[PDB]
Ligand binder design. Structure first.
Ligand SMILES: [Cl-]
Ligand SMILES: [Cl-]
Ligand SMILES: [Cl-]
Ligand SMILES: [Cl-]
Ligand SMILES: [Cl-]
Ligand SMILES: [Cl-]
Ligand SMILES: [Cl-]
Ligand SMILES: [Cl-]
Ligand SMILES: [Cl-]
Ligand SMILES: [Cl-]
Ligand SMILES: [Cl-]
Ligand SMILES: [Cl-]
Ligand SMILES: [Cl-]
Ligand SMILES: [Cl-]
Ligand SMILES: [Cl-]
Ligand SMILES: [Cl-]
Ligand SMILES: [Cl-]
Ligand SMILES: [Cl-]
Lengths: 210, 12, 210, 12, 210, 210, 12, 12, 210, 210, 12, 12
């Protein structure tokens, strides 16, 4: 195991400062946190000053997933064989009850116990709930202005849809339901003159220059 | 519930 | 597989901020994305905040290429031999239905399945459509001003031609068709006094200082 | 069509 | 043993300049100080200009832990066998009476003597006492303003609780004791209308927009 | 083959922004492009936004050298033996008709086909023609002012001579022909009072303080 | 003449 | 008590 | 032997520019100079522009230590055996009379001659004399103001004590002798009301808020 | 052979921009140029824009040393044995008549021909002549002002002496000859009251606060 | 005299 | 006394 480089912490601290809890901070978290042990993950979360409300919401989500892991992967009493390793509990995956050496031993075992990937899934799950919840705009409030260029409105549309709560079933049908409807009347007449089944490229091109 | 409020991530 | 360095994400995020969707962002995307798995590619796209209209157009183009792959490379049912690996579907190349380990196994196989290169070709194809479409200038509107230095007009000419839609057959003949024609009358008399077949170096040198 | 609108690249 | 990279010292010096003794400087200290020998740790502390009051408090805490180590791990007189190594004293773990080579020999022994991890625990223990002591706010003084958004008050609540002295038993019960009580009357009526056992996500969502 | 680091593209993009087409950009191009495949070279050129007039002149020069290679290294029809590799055509060296794997196979062959070095020579040849052509000053227009310090005039002299077209035979004799002649009358009397065969160090020292 | 005007260096 | 006041961390 | 990275020289040059000769520049010098040959050490000192008075004082201190080495480690005439190496003189340790290859051969010998560590000790000894001598404040002049917060006065106290000349015997007793005595009368009454033997943490906490 | 990193060229270009031809640019040149082939050295010199007067003086000095090498190491005609390598001429060491592969073969031979170190010595010799010649101050013009602090005057003294032409015999005796003589009368009376043989530390300390 | 004026260091 | 005034550290 090699350590978090100073440029990796530096970039994670700065991206939380700049982008706060916008959707694009989760993929950069997972990218910066790649191959990380639970101890490295806890270090990344501990370096975040401020936003302590979301960090507390992150702890509750992790505690929920850890309790589900303990119900689905119950521990068994008994001495550990010399060649093998004890199973990780919920707190073990979160780095609470486990050491760095045990986390490595789980991640390099045969078969390996990717405790880092499991913990990262819990953190990302808790981070996804914070992003959509910190969003103050619904997809229904995204309407094209009388002179708003069509690309700018479609840009706000899918930026809102990405951070939207709702569900994937709503996001899949949002374009066919709300995009053309909430466009301004001049662009709307052009889009209806294309017929359903038109791609986004065909819609944006038909309303270019308007 | 391993993580505690006001405590560092990963316990003491 | 080693991970996307923090300087690689940082440079990709900043180049999308600065250069937006100008032609020079595709080569730097392919350079920063070299040897990248489909998961690394999806991470690079997910880090882009804003420009969600183009990112949605990118998803549609990728879905089109993935459907063409499934029609040209149909899957076959059956259990995978212990020594080999299952064929990648369209969603597998896009990292949707495939894991990181399967993407590595495909890219390091013998013979290898370069799922990263195939996915990158789809992304670059979708990015090329966005660049030329976001261009608001045709090569026909590039005319040399009465006092515009010849190098500045030729600079705007080929900058427009690079991002131009049209086709390669038009770009190949654009210089012989439009360059000398849309030059100002004083430089035009010098260029016609050179005879056809003159190189660009000969044309720009003949009109130096004008 | 693997990629979905409003969803991260690469699915859930 | 490879040395502290110039980017690691640079980042440690700058984080002490910027964040002073806020809670998030301890995890970044432990991250930057990973796998570090006692000599590397002393170098990191010696590079800190200013804050010499806390650095002197850090020396006293380290001297206390070193005295406890000498009482719990008493030395034994006798010549060291050619294959082995002498036990580290308290001053040896602090890098005072030990060389760089002995620190390496302890950390790479079989079984290893992680003198760096032991010294880091003492330093972090001394740094934790400085952070909570340099905090000028108790959790009891965190009250929500008449128009303070609920997220901002919960942000100040857990930021104060993180740097709070008190004890973990108080921090565990602080949310159920003080959070809803010290909220403004308009948000308070909504939270009491949810019933006890509500998660933080449920509390912050119920008072959104207020 | 390892890829162009993000700091290498970043430095190449910034040096084209700052120094444009001054003489010192060719050596830094060749330094940043060291051991680069034709694909890496094409990537470096493709990242240049603007200056599309010179980039088009660069394509014509490369096409000229590629045609000369095809006339001097004619291809031979026939199947490639299993142990060897096909000869590179002109377009193959330019990365047009060749893959990354074939470029590696040529560069690591025994004996190796340094297609990267051959392509770099063509690019540098095209870049050298752009630098001297974009220079708007001849060595004959470099005259020392009445109060211009001798070092400043000699600085402009050899800066002009470096980017000068002309030929190496002219550059070799330029110092003995134009330097002392185009100096101001007060420094001129001192230099003629030294006799021919004086080094540059002797000339600049004789006119110090003037 | 491999390189083409208005086209990326190295062809399509 | 190895560490001394006004002295570098790690002694002389 | 691998060379001083450009980031290591860059950081050493900048830290001399910023922090001058404050106490924290010696530990960062020793950290940046780790595993360095005498030639690398001389390079680090030679890169310092300005402060040439201290650099000349550094040469005299090194010449003093080199003369002491020659008196304590006298050389012996005779031919060097093919398997071994000549002993380093005083000038050899300073890199004056020795080559880079001999310095490596000494540092990688069995047993090794750490000429770099010996030279670094001389340089650090000369740098320690410059730091305390360039200090313009004695510990006796550090008195707490009528409204100076106790932490700020203790911060100036130990910052002065760290750079103080005097001796370690004075620095050890300075806290019990001068700290409480030179505090303002209001904080002084609280500290005397604690009894001797109080830790620094107990003293600073008793006077918090004053 | 691995290439000049982009950070190494970047640092060399910036240090020529900032520090010009001050004495501290030669050690940083030799540090950045470590283990460099003659081709890497020529690349470093070619990246310098401006200062073309000194670069031309650098070429003349290199041509002088190369001619001395050809007179002291005359070449011998004959075919090179398959196991060995041809001797480097003067132009070969300067990278003019030699390839990169021959430079490597010389530097990794047994016994090795360090053509890079030989060329670097010539460049540094030419750079040393430019630094002292570009200095516009003699050590005789360094006099202490009536209120100039003694450390500032000694700082200007040895900064001038470092870049001074003259010779090492003059620099060795300059302190005993000019330092105390050119001090202001008030500091002068204190220094003469110390007796000859006083160290620089003793002289600067005796005049502290004046 | 390998190096030439107005020419890159290291010849053509 | 290897180091000399006005001379680079490490001699000529
Ligand atoms: Cl933050
Ligand atoms: Cl276990
Ligand atoms: Cl909006
Ligand atoms: Cl963006
Ligand atoms: Cl499979
Ligand atoms: Cl335009
Ligand atoms: Cl500080
Ligand atoms: Cl021992
Ligand atoms: Cl507060
Ligand atoms: Cl540009
Ligand atoms: Cl082939
Ligand atoms: Cl000019
Ligand atoms: Cl300085
Ligand atoms: Cl020897
Ligand atoms: Cl003070
Ligand atoms: Cl410059
Ligand atoms: Cl040879
Ligand atoms: Cl001066």
């Amino acid at each position: 195991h090699q350590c978090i480089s100073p440029r990796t912490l530096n970039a994670w601290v700065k991206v939380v400062e700049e982008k706060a809890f916008s959707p694009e901070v989760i993929p950069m978290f997972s990218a910066l946190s790649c191959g990380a042990t639970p101890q490295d993950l806890n270090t990344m979360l501990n370096t975040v000053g401020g936003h302590q409300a979301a960090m507390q919401m992150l702890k509750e989500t992790i505690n929920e997933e850890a309790a589900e892991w303990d119900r689905l992967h119950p521990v068994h009493a008994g001495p550990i064989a010399p060649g093998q390793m004890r199973e990780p509990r919920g707190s073990d995956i979160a780095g609470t009850t486990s050491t760095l050496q045990e986390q490595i031993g789980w991640m390099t075992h045969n078969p390996p116990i990717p405790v880092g990937e499991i913990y990262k899934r819990w953190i990302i799950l808790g981070l996804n709930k914070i992003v959509r919840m910190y969003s103050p705009t619904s997809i229904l409030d995204i309407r094209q202005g009388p002179k708003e260029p069509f690309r700018d409105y479609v840009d706000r549309f899918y930026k809102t849809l990405r951070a939207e709560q709702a569900s994937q079933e709503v996001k899949n049908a949002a374009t066919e339901t709300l995009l053309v409807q909430n466009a301004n009347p001049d662009c709307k007449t052009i889009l209806k003159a294309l017929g359903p089944g038109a791609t986004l490229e065909e819609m944006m091109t038909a309303c270019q220059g308007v | 519930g391993p993580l505690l409020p006001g405590q560092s991530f990963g316990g003491p």
